[PDB]
Write a protein that binds this ligand. Structure first.
Ligand code: GSH
Ligand code: GSH
Ligand code: GSH
Ligand code: GSH
Lengths: 284, 285
């Protein structure tokens, strides 16, 4: 194989995502989004990125902020729901999560999980230092997470778990980088309880959804063995602490095949068996 | 066909040119302190698109008269492992450029990641980022979009098309397709808006412009502009052309660059270059 002078879209690419991945953006059909009664309207799926948004909102509800009540509407990314006119209008990039803030007289969109986390942390004044050097430390780790997850999911996850052919050079490239990123976190968590200081912030939440899912064996087949996750004992400590947070236990279940399809009221969780909200096990 | 082992082992080089630095472990590999100059901001960087975000931002602030944005930009040679000295790891645990130390107050502190540097500076000086209101959310959305998507352009497309030792059709196709999709996102936005997050230039534009302009104008990744049909993105081209004319862009692009200044330690340093370099875009080597 020799790359052509001009790339053309003529072959399938993406494995399980080959029915949605395209070289062009924009909507593929006309459909409006549903709107509920609560101030925050979230359009998402319970992947690590969706979980950032729904955990953040559940964290705010644990603190008593009624302005954080939310409707979490299901977006099925294997089905192309991210390409409806209504979804593209709230996220031009056609990825979950995306949100509409309806808490004021004029609604507006917020897209990208990092922007959603920042927006909510700034609105309520929690989980992000409002000023001082600690703010810069938190932002540094949050942007680090956003800039590095593509290597873990779009790189390692894709080539290890979804690509139709196993490609040694690509698997090696992204397995190596994923381990390096876990080592960055592990070395930080050897010296600090949380990534950006002594307290849990949005930088921890953002990293945790990805790292905990991989570390505890729930993501990408046998990846936890493949990547020698046992090496990262400080990551493990921090995953265990965050796993225990009530807002994490609730938020991780939203838009999830193992939890709630959607969330429209706090009482929706009463439909689940009590075991679904109990401690995330660590052993085998 | 290849069969992955049960447990991954680091048994083969990976990275092409970058195989002399890419590792599955983090942390410092030598003890060396960072140099420190006289100015309030100390930047440790290289004039890649990500380094240019930092140096352009500082030059934009100096363009507005903010003397508190004066800076030393020290060169970090990423092919040679300068990013793994103890001094550099101390300011960026992730060992990537740009990173900086804010020495403007009584206690210095690190800021790492280009997006965090842009936000830190925009918040400090109250410019290039709406301080409140729905426009702030729009700006942050586009800025995080840039940071979350550049890995597909550089770590995906650029790597497989330009650096990997073997041309891998599936990987080149995956990331060429995604790079084009991201250009199309920007192109469709810029068809309806002068800038990404509204009518005015913000840090979201600066962050995206360094990458998109370098690819679009033909200076990144060999023949990528022809390969990716850059001529298709006329609104990206219009926006690149507008940002190209800003003096802070023209100066900041030249910092830590093999076609500009190796380092910046004072505003007069630019008088070492041909004067035309400050007046029109210079394409990198
Ligand atoms: N940088 C983005 C990444 C979001 C992302 O990868 N979303 C995925 C699910 S986790 C998605 O919606 N993919 C749809 C698609 O690629 O078509 C963020 O942090 O929100
Ligand atoms: N178009 C995407 C569809 C899959 C997708 O969006 N995956 C998510 C995780 S479910 C991902 O890798 N997100 C990267 C990030 O968060 O930056 C692809 O082909 O990789
Ligand atoms: N998300 C990071 C990406 C920074 C990045 O990719 N830095 C590259 C040069 S542009 C680097 O220093 N690479 C060194 C290495 O990989 O060893 C940011 O926006 O700052
Ligand atoms: N370790 C890196 C070294 C090269 C590198 O860091 N490249 C930069 C551009 S020079 C990149 O793609 N950064 C991704 C980003 O900005 O998110 C690799 O092999 O990809």
């Amino acid at each position: 194989y020799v790359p052509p002078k001009v790339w053309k879209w003529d072959k399938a690419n993406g494995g399980a995502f080959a029915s949605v991945n395209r070289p062009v953006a924009g909507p593929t059909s006309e459909r409006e989004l549903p709107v509920g009664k609560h101030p925050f309207q979230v359009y998402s799926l319970g992947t690590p990125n969706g979980q950032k948004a729904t955990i953040m909102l559940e964290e705010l509800l644990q603190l008593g902020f009624s302005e954080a009540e939310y409707d979490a509407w299901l977006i099925k990314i294997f089905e192309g729901d991210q390409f409806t006119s209504g979804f593209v209008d709230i996220n031009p990039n056609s990825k979950i999560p995306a949100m509409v803030d309806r808490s004021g007289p004029e609604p507006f969109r917020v897209f990208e999980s990092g922007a959603i986390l920042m927006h909510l942390a700034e609105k309520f004044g929690v989980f992000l230092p409002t000023s001082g050097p600690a703010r810069a430390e938190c932002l540094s780790w949050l942007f680090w997470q956003v800039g590095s997850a593509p290597f873990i999911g779009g790189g390692f996850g894709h080539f290890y778990n979804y690509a139709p052919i196993k490609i040694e050079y690509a698997i090696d490239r992204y397995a190596m980088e994923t381990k390096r990123l876990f080592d960055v976190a592990n070395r930080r968590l050897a010296e600090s309880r949380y990534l950006a200081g002594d307290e849990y912030t949005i930088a921890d939440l953002a990293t945790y959804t990805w790292f905990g899912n991989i570390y505890r064996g729930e993501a990408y087949g046998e990846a936890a063995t493949f990547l020698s996750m046992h090496e990262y004992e400080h990551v493990g400590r921090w995953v265990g602490e965050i796993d225990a947070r009530p807002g994490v236990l609730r938020g991780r279940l939203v838009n999830s095949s193992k939890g709630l399809a959607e969330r429209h009221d706090a009482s929706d969780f009463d439909a689940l068996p009590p075991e679904s909200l109990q401690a995330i096990v660590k052993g085998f």
